Swiss-Prot record:
<dbReference type="InterPro" id="IPR011009">
    <property type="entry name" value="Kinase-like_dom_sf"/>
</dbReference>
<dbReference type="GO" id="GO:0043560">
    <property type="term" value="F:insulin receptor substrate binding"/>
</dbReference>
<dbReference type="GO" id="GO:0014704">
    <property type="term" value="C:intercalated disc"/>
</dbReference>
<dbReference type="GO" id="GO:0004674">
    <property type="term" value="F:protein serine/threonine kinase activity"/>
</dbReference>
<dbReference type="InterPro" id="IPR016024">
    <property type="entry name" value="ARM-type_fold"/>
</dbReference>
<dbReference type="GO" id="GO:0014870">
    <property type="term" value="P:response to muscle inactivity"/>
</dbReference>
<dbReference type="GO" id="GO:0010629">
    <property type="term" value="P:negative regulation of gene expression"/>
</dbReference>
<dbReference type="GO" id="GO:0005944">
    <property type="term" value="C:phosphatidylinositol 3-kinase complex, class IB"/>
</dbReference>
<dbReference type="GO" id="GO:0043542">
    <property type="term" value="P:endothelial cell migration"/>
</dbReference>
<dbReference type="GO" id="GO:0048009">
    <property type="term" value="P:insulin-like growth factor receptor signaling pathway"/>
</dbReference>
<dbReference type="Pfam" id="PF00613">
    <property type="entry name" value="PI3Ka"/>
</dbReference>
<dbReference type="GO" id="GO:0086003">
    <property type="term" value="P:cardiac muscle cell contraction"/>
</dbReference>
<dbReference type="GO" id="GO:0048015">
    <property type="term" value="P:phosphatidylinositol-mediated signaling"/>
</dbReference>
<dbReference type="GO" id="GO:0030168">
    <property type="term" value="P:platelet activation"/>
</dbReference>
<dbReference type="InterPro" id="IPR018936">
    <property type="entry name" value="PI3/4_kinase_CS"/>
</dbReference>
<keyword id="KW-0808">Transferase</keyword>
<dbReference type="GO" id="GO:0030036">
    <property type="term" value="P:actin cytoskeleton organization"/>
</dbReference>
């Protein structure tokens, strides 16, 4: 009954649901019950126009955010019309009958269906269109060219192949539950803040001390205060630390950031041994008081500082770790943060053309540009004129003295009536610099208003990451993402996998596990599919573990014999066949084609897997799905680079710059485990050179690449391939340069039969690469001038969207990626984009880099 659902949820998360029942934290239990409101609202939205609304939940339209086709895409059409092939399965014999149409690019799915009925009768609105080869439907009245598949066909030159299907055939397959577990004002406390550091347990160099601070985000609200140094032992300090801040001046998001530091005498070497952060107010707005024990966390690699203020808040669940005992003051009553009306009353009681141009210039600086003390005072004094340049809100929020309740009360009034800003600008307000709940609430409301499901999917990795910067389990951001996940199954699929992949990380495991329980409880029959995906991934992790540890250096043929022997076991055959691809849940993975699978020779010995596509029309898309499974590489850097490449391509496409990129799929499934989408018909430059080269001859020649392209494209198709190569080469030259991608050797650069060039392996970023061989394919015979112009325009287009790229990296700051540990790492993009120069000065910098 409910025990069956809880067992399936437990297998999906990787931890039993009864472990959440054991958690005594009132915040945990209140989250579990209060989040059910979002579950019910999503379930009600699915039954609104049932069964059509339920079908659009399971099969949402995969569309672009704009119907307007850029001038260069419209030119690929035949007088604004497209040729589509509509297929029908006739039964008996399941014969595939096609009907070819020439219709307006903006025809809605029902108009396409009506035109197919006309063509079929040359030898009624109860039909739907499906993409041939995959479980993707056109269930919504969008213009046909707005669907990503159709838009992608126009660009790739391919002909769209759709399948006409009875509406009742699909609706019949759509499957048809609340769980059992369902004062003084802060401003009247006249005293200053003091916190007692009692003692530490589970700390066995010369002397030890506790480093403390009051922080709002990563900014200290007063000076940091340390306890006395004590000789190691299990130190007792019994010392009240006094902060230069009065209790009423404490902002709502104020935190205590602790560290147990060691001192080693030589000048003195100070090292943090463990760290922990505490919210000074709990989720119910109560200022903390009384005794409290905090279990600390291990210091993350590359900290450098003594405190970790960006780090997660709360006690380490492993209670066998350094444990610090603290005491807060009790003011003879439960103290609460004042209501918005009370703050409003205090904000009221708290009271040129050269200025307008200076405010406009400050507003246009990137998120990492430094804002001086004079500028902060200038912005705050003109705070009322600022509501007329809404894009200045991030700069104005950093000008506020958060340790002054008079300025904060006035900022709350400005935030309450601030005009909405674009989602790419509102995402800046969700990073670690903006912990204030009013600032975060405004940013979330801008996302609910202006974020399409396409853009939400595009930015999902950052939105799941910024959940770690939230003070509490229950917040506006989590409610927004969970609702969107429970009303769009494509969002829910990746939402589940982004959370599940981080369950090994104990700093987030409880937050993400509780969030996963509410998702699994309301996602419906998709939980059964997710369980099959989980089981296939576990079986592949076990298989690659044995391969890398036991048969580490065995031959490929002896490795395959173990693979085939393990795929003789019933549990393995069941687990690795008949499940949806986590890279794209529209792709069903049928039977494993072991004869096409292999253990790759590459580092960590990845698995190259091949499955039959069991779609009735598989031949019209791809008969087999190939996926690389890797155990050992942190695929998070690759995921982020692949997302950035996708965004850069959209920037270029919308500006009339057809620079074709290949952001293939990559998904992190857990700790250094994951999947990589195989681009079919592709080869590395090293493989192209070791094809033109013979047995014993040099595997090194700069004229081989252009020769292999000519053999693959003879005739009229040669001109198209050279143009595609030039455009894609231009895009990747600009991209790898701006992002500072390393290891750009001929085994990490690939080419497709059609001329399309792309890069792979992004283990290095944020710290130019071209060969003579590529120049031969593209020295300056008019083709180099056209290629140069492409690079210049591509470089400037990315420079105009620099704030978005800086923000996407800034939101990932708390992931733990070795190449992205502070805002100084992101400053590498400010240098390549030359944001400290003018538009013409940045182009000359880029031209000097290209000529070098
Ligand atoms: C075609 N040559 S090959 O002989 O099959 N083979 C020879 C070696 C080469 N390997 C080596 C590593 C590798 C990766 C890869 C692995 N780890 C990360 N982190 N990032 C990318 N990705 C692809 N690709 C295939 C094309 O589509 C995109 C994915 N291939 C790869 C394939």
């Amino acid at each position: 009954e409910e025990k069956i659902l809880n067992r399936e949820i437990g297998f999906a998360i990787g931890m039993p649901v009864c472990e959440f029942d054991m958690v005594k934290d009132p915040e945990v239990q209140d989250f579990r019950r209060n989040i059910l409101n979002v579950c019910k609202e999503a379930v009600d939205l699915r039954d609104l126009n049932s069964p059509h609304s339920r079908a659009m939940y399971v099969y949402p339209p995969n569309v672009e955010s704009s119907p307007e086709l850029p001038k260069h895409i419209y030119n690929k059409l035949d007088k604004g019309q497209i040729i589509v092939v509509i297929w029908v399965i006739v039964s008996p014999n399941n014969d595939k009958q096609k009907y070819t149409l020439k219709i307006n690019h903006d025809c809605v799915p029902e108009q396409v269906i009506a035109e197919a009925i006309r063509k079929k009768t040359r030898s009624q609105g109860k039909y739907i269109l499906k993409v041939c080869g995959c479980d993707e439907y056109f269930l919504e009245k969008y213009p046909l060219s707005q669907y990503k598949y159709i838009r992608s066909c126009i660009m790739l030159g391919r002909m769209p192949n759709l399948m006409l299907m009875a509406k009742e055939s699909l609706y019949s397959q759509l499957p048809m539950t609340m769980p059992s577990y369902s004062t003084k004002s802060l401003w009247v406390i006249n005293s200053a803040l003091r916190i007692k550091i009692l003692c530490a347990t589970y700390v066995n160099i010369d002397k030890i001390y506790v480093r403390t601070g009051i922080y709002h985000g990563g900014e200290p609200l007063c000076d940091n205060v340390n306890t006395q140094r004590v000789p190691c032992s299990n130190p007792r300090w019994n010392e009240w630390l006094n902060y230069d801040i009065y209790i009423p001046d404490l902002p709502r998001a104020a935190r205590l950031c602790l560290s147990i530091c060691s001192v080693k005498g030589r000048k003195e070497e100070h090292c943090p041994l463990a760290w922990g952060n505490i919210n000074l107010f709990d989720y119910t707005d109560t200022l903390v008081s009384g005794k409290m024990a905090l279990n600390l966390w291990p210091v993350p690699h590359g900290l450098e500082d003594l405190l970790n203020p960006i780090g997660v808040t709360g006690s380490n669940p492993n209670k066998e770790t350094p444990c610090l005992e603290l005491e807060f003051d009790w003011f003879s009553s439960v103290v609460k943060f004042p209501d918005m009306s009370v703050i409003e009353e205090h904000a009221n009681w708290s009271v040129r053309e050269n200025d307008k141009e200076q405010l406009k210039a400050i507003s246009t600086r990137d998120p990492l540009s430094e804002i001086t003390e004079q500028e902060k005072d200038f912005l705050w004094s003109h705070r009322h004129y600022c509501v007329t340049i809404p894009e200045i809100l991030p700069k104005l929020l950093l000008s506020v003295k958060w340790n002054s309740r008079d300025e904060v009360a006035q900022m709350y009034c400005l935030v309450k009536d601030w005009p909405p800003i674009k989602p790419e600008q509102a995402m800046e307000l969700l990073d670690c610099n903006y912990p204030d709940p009013m600032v975060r609430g405004f940013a979330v409301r801008c996302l609910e208003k202006y974020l399409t499901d396409d853009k939400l999917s595009q930015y999902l990795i950052q939105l799941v990451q910024v959940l770690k910067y939230e003070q509490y389990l229950d917040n506006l951001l989590v409610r927004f993402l969970l609702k969107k996940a429970l009303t769009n199954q494509r969002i829910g699929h990746f939402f589940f996998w982004h959370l599940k992949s981080e369950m090994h990380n104990k700093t987030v495991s409880q937050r993400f596990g509780l969030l996963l329980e509410s998702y699994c409880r309301a996602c419906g029959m998709y939980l059964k599919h997710l369980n099959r995906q989980v089981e296939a991934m576990e079986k592949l992790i076990n298989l690659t573990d044995i391969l890398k540890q036991e048969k580490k250096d065995e031959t490929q043929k002896v490795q395959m014999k173990f693979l085939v022997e393990q795929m003789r076991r019933p549990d393995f055959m069941d687990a690795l066949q008949g499940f949806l691809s986590p890279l794209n849940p529209a792709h069903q993975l049928g039977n494993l084609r072991l004869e096409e699978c292999r253990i790759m020779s590459s580092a960590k010995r990845p698995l190259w897997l091949n499955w039959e596509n069991p779609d009735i029309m598989s031949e019209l898309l791809f008969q087999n799905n190939e996926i690389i499974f890797k155990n050992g590489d942190d695929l998070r850097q690759d995921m982020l680079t692949l997302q950035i490449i996708r965004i850069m391509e959209n920037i270029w496409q919308n500006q009339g710059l057809d620079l074709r990129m290949l952001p293939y799929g990559c998904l992190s499934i857990g700790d250094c485990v994951g999947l990589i989408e195989v681009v079919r018909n592709s080869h590395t430059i090293m493989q192209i050179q070791c094809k033109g080269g013979l047995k014993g001859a040099l595997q090194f020649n700069s004229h081989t690449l252009h020769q292999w392209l000519k053999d693959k494209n003879k005739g009229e198709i040669y001109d198209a391939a050279i143009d595609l190569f030039t455009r894609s080469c231009a895009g990747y030259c600009v991209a790898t340069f701006i992002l500072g991608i390393g290891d750009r050797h001929n085994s990490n650069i690939m080419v497709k039969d059609d001329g399309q060039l792309f890069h792979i392996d992004f283990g290095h970023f944020l710290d130019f690469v071209l060969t003579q061989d590529f120049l031969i394919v593209i020295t300056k015979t008019r083709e180099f001038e056209r290629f140069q112009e492409m690079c210049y325009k591509a470089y400037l287009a990315i420079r105009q969207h620099a704030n978005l790229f800086i923000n996407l990296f800034s939101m990932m700051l708390g992931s733990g990626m070795p190449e992205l540990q502070s805002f100084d790492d992101i400053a590498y993009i400010r240098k390549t984009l030359a944001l400290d120069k003018t538009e013409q000065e940045a182009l000359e910098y880029f031209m000097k880099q290209m000529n070098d």
